[PDB]
């Protein structure tokens, strides 16, 4: 049976540490995204881009954080810039996971290099519903069918992210669950080219214990949710494979200030 003992309390404090860091590193939380998407917020109502006329009007009315004549490339470039920002936020989050900054720096880089796309699919789900995706820190909303309407190869770029999100969002995870789930993904001891695997697995084992407890406490209706989330971490591996294949097609078939 489950007991409230010193070990369980340490796992709750680890979970709370990760939640607080997650809130700090990712300003637009799932709770705030859901409130925007269900019209249950007093914050500013997002502008909806559902066709070319509303895109042209949105470019001018939505206030994008980034200063080609082709719509599909302008949108893909906005996508690229947002991913650079997300890599930074994810790296800031990783620095808060107990043990991570004490690992060999090369292994810190390798964990993040192979982890950030899995975490990007994960965090995009928080911003997605059946209709579309929140953009520009919640100031805009771009529809799933408008993205699908963009010419090849851009039209199929976001489709697998929506597909994943439909199934993932049905698990009804909250920010406390996601904080730990993302930390487990980052501390994957099977990334290619790691030098010192055991210390990574040691941290992951503690994170897995914390995740399991979080899901039992937070999800009374789903006894095997832990197993279901490990299944999603497995799915994200083959899905990122397909994402990087499509990124290479774009890099060599089509034409960020921090990158200089």
């Amino acid at each position: 049976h489950m007991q409230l003992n010193p070990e369980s309390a340490d796992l709750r404090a680890l979970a709370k540490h990760l939640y607080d860091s997650y809130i700090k590193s990712f300003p637009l939380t799932k709770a705030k995204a859901r409130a925007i998407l269900t019209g249950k917020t007093t914050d500013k109502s997002p502008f909806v881009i559902y066709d070319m006329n509303s895109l042209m009007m949105g470019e001018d009315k939505i206030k994008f954080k980034h200063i080609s004549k082709e719509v599909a490339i302008r949108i893909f470039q906005g996508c690229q810039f947002r991913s650079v920002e997300a890599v930074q936020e994810i790296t800031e989050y990783a620095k808060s996971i107990p043990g991570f900054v004490n690992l060999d720096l090369n292994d810190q880089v390798t964990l993040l290099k192979y982890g950030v796309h899995e975490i990007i699919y994960t965090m995009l789900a928080s911003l997605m519903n059946k209709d579309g995706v929140l953009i520009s820190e919640g100031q805009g909303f771009m529809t799933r069918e408008f993205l699908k309407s963009l010419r090849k190869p851009f039209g199929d770029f976001m489709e697998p992210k929506f597909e994943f999100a439909v199934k993932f969002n049905a698990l009804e995870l909250d920010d406390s669950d996601l904080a730990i789930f993302i930390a487990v993904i980052i501390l994957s001891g099977d990334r290619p080219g790691l030098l010192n695997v055991k210390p990574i697995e040691d941290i992951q084992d503690n994170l897995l214990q914390a995740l399991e407890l979080q899901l039992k406490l937070n999800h009374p209706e789903s006894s095997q949710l832990f197993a279901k989330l490990l299944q999603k971490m497995t799915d994200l591996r083959q899905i990122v494979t397909e994402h990087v294949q499509l990124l290479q097609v774009i890099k060599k078939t089509e034409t960020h200030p921090l990158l200089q």
């Binding site: 890599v87 930074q88 790296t91 950030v116 990158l259």
Partner: peptide, 11 residues
């Protein structure tokens, strides 16, 4: 680029 941004963000 990805590695460069990670090393930048880690420092």
């Amino acid at each position: 680029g990805l590695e460069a941004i990670i090393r930048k963000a880690l420092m």
